Design an enzyme around this catalytic site. Structure first.
Site, short mmCIF file in Angstrom:
data_model
loop_
_atom_site.label_atom_id
_atom_site.label_comp_id
_atom_site.label_asym_id
_atom_site.label_seq_id
_atom_site.Cartn_x
_atom_site.Cartn_y
_atom_site.Cartn_z
N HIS A 128 93.16 51.10 78.70
CA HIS A 128 92.82 51.62 77.37
C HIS A 128 92.57 53.12 77.38
O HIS A 128 92.74 53.77 76.35
CB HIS A 128 91.69 50.85 76.68
CG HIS A 128 90.34 51.13 77.22
ND1 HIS A 128 89.67 50.21 77.99
CD2 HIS A 128 89.58 52.24 77.12
CE1 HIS A 128 88.52 50.77 78.32
NE2 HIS A 128 88.42 51.99 77.82
N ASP A 150 93.20 44.91 81.27
CA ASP A 150 92.78 46.28 81.11
C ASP A 150 92.66 46.97 82.47
O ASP A 150 91.57 47.18 83.01
CB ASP A 150 91.49 46.32 80.30
CG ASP A 150 91.14 47.67 79.76
OD1 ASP A 150 92.03 48.60 79.80
OD2 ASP A 150 89.99 47.86 79.38
N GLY A 203 82.37 56.59 77.35
CA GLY A 203 82.68 57.56 78.40
C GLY A 203 82.59 56.99 79.80
O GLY A 203 83.00 57.66 80.77
N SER A 238 84.02 53.92 80.56
CA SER A 238 85.15 53.03 80.77
C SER A 238 86.14 53.57 81.81
O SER A 238 86.22 54.79 82.01
CB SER A 238 85.81 52.63 79.46
OG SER A 238 86.46 53.74 78.90
N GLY A 239 86.73 52.65 82.55
CA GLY A 239 87.67 52.96 83.62
C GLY A 239 86.98 53.08 84.97
O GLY A 239 87.61 52.91 86.02
O1 LIG Z 1 83.84 63.12 75.05
C1 LIG Z 1 83.47 62.17 74.35
O2 LIG Z 1 82.78 62.32 73.25
C2 LIG Z 1 83.83 60.75 74.68
C3 LIG Z 1 83.52 59.70 73.82
C4 LIG Z 1 83.89 58.40 74.13
C5 LIG Z 1 84.59 58.13 75.31
N1 LIG Z 1 85.04 56.85 75.73
C6 LIG Z 1 84.92 55.64 75.12
O3 LIG Z 1 84.24 55.42 74.12
C7 LIG Z 1 85.81 54.55 75.73
C8 LIG Z 1 87.05 54.36 74.80
C9 LIG Z 1 88.34 55.07 75.13
C10 LIG Z 1 88.45 55.95 76.20
C11 LIG Z 1 89.61 56.66 76.41
C12 LIG Z 1 90.69 56.51 75.55
C13 LIG Z 1 90.60 55.63 74.49
C14 LIG Z 1 89.43 54.91 74.29
C15 LIG Z 1 87.16 52.83 74.68
C16 LIG Z 1 85.74 52.33 74.80
N2 LIG Z 1 85.16 53.25 75.77
C17 LIG Z 1 84.14 52.98 76.63
O4 LIG Z 1 83.67 53.87 77.34
C18 LIG Z 1 83.61 51.60 76.66
C19 LIG Z 1 82.33 51.38 76.62
C20 LIG Z 1 81.63 50.10 76.77
C21 LIG Z 1 81.83 49.40 77.97
C22 LIG Z 1 80.98 48.36 78.30
CL1 LIG Z 1 81.21 47.53 79.83
C23 LIG Z 1 79.95 47.98 77.47
C24 LIG Z 1 79.76 48.64 76.27
C25 LIG Z 1 80.62 49.67 75.89
N3 LIG Z 1 80.51 50.20 74.57
C26 LIG Z 1 80.51 49.60 73.37
N4 LIG Z 1 80.52 50.49 72.42
N5 LIG Z 1 80.51 51.70 73.06
N6 LIG Z 1 80.50 51.54 74.35
C27 LIG Z 1 84.89 59.18 76.18
C28 LIG Z 1 84.51 60.47 75.86
#
Ligand SMILES: O=C(O)c1ccc(NC(=O)[C@@H]2[C@@H](c3ccccc3)CCN2C(=O)/C=C/c2cc(Cl)ccc2-n2cnnn2)cc1
Length: 238
Positions: A44, A93, A186, A188-189
């Site tokens: 993702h 994923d 932030g 994820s991955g």
């Molecule tokens: O610089 C920034 O502001 C900045 C802002 C957000 C992200 N990243 C993200 O939100 C990335 C997204 C992404 C990244 C890259 C491309 C496309 C989509 C997809 C979700 N995601 C997570 O990190 C997932 C989080 C997550 C994981 C688990 Cl195990 C539990 C709860 C979670 N959450 C629920 N609701 N929020 N977190 C990265 C950087």
């Protein structure tokens, strides 16, 4: 990371920060070094990424402030996304980044072992989720790499918490019933690293959840043990 503390330098030497160049340079996702030219991360992460040319992998970083225009990085030669991948919530994923140059292993950067197919039956009691993600749902990327110890949750329990979803055996959940500690935006991955018989194993890849660290909402991770064959297929191609 929600409810986590600052990591010590060199504590998670397989953890990398994947940055995007477009439109401006910023942290995109976490990832793990699994081989000298391989990063394992979440598929993702590459939503809207049209070329590997905009990616930069940084290893041996504790603080994002260590990253300036003069900071060395690895370029990405190829992005390999699981071909069954549609969306995080449906599974598959997982992705591999093939690096343009070889990672030189040292005390600041080295690989994490993949789980053994023989270790599908082990009960991991010492698991940690790491990243530079938000500390709460409305926040910003953190400077210092954060860590949080989280307990693994059974598929059965996780399915009870995600009504309306299908929590497959290709997913692994982690979290406290009361909430408080989890991955967040932030993170994820990045890895879900578990220590077993004094060796660290890459058990999960941070994938998704309903909010961050909520009561009865465990974080959902790609179950890496279920993808060892796919990883070997892509990394050991003749
Ligand atoms: O610089 C920034 O502001 C900045 C802002 C957000 C992200 N990243 C993200 O939100 C990335 C997204 C992404 C990244 C890259 C491309 C496309 C989509 C997809 C979700 N995601 C997570 O990190 C997932 C989080 C997550 C994981 C688990 Cl195990 C539990 C709860 C979670 N959450 C629920 N609701 N929020 N977190 C990265 C950087």
């Amino acid at each position: 990371i929600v409810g986590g503390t600052a990591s010590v330098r060199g504590e998670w030497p397989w953890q990398v920060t994947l940055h995007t160049t477009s439109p401006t340079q910023r942290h995109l996702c976490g990832g793990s070094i699994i081989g000298n030219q391989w990063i394992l991360t979440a598929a993702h992460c590459f939503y809207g990424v049209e070329s590997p040319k905009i990616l930069r992998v940084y290893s041996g970083i504790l603080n994002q402030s260590e990253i300036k225009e003069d900071t060395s990085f690895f370029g990405v030669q190829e992005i390999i996304i699981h071909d069954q991948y549609k969306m995080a919530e449906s599974g598959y994923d997982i992705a591999l980044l093939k690096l343009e140059t070889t990672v030189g292993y040292g005390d600041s950067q080295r690989p994490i072992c993949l789980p053994s197919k023989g270790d599908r039956n082990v009960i991991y009691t010492d698991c940690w989720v790491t990243g530079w993600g938000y500390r709460k749902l409305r926040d910003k990327i953190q400077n210092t790499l954060q860590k949080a110890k989280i307990p693994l949750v059974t598929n059965e329990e996780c399915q009870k918490r995600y009504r309306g979803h299908k929590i497959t055996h290709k997913m692994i959940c982690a979290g406290y019933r009361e909430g408080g500690k989890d991955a967040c935006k932030g993170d994820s991955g990045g890895p879900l690293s578990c220590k077993h018989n004094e060796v660290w194993h890459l058990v999960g890849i941070t994938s998704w959840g309903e909010g961050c660290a909520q009561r009865e909402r465990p974080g959902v991770y790609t179950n890496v043990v279920e993808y060892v064959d796919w990883i070997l297929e892509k990394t050991q191609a003749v």
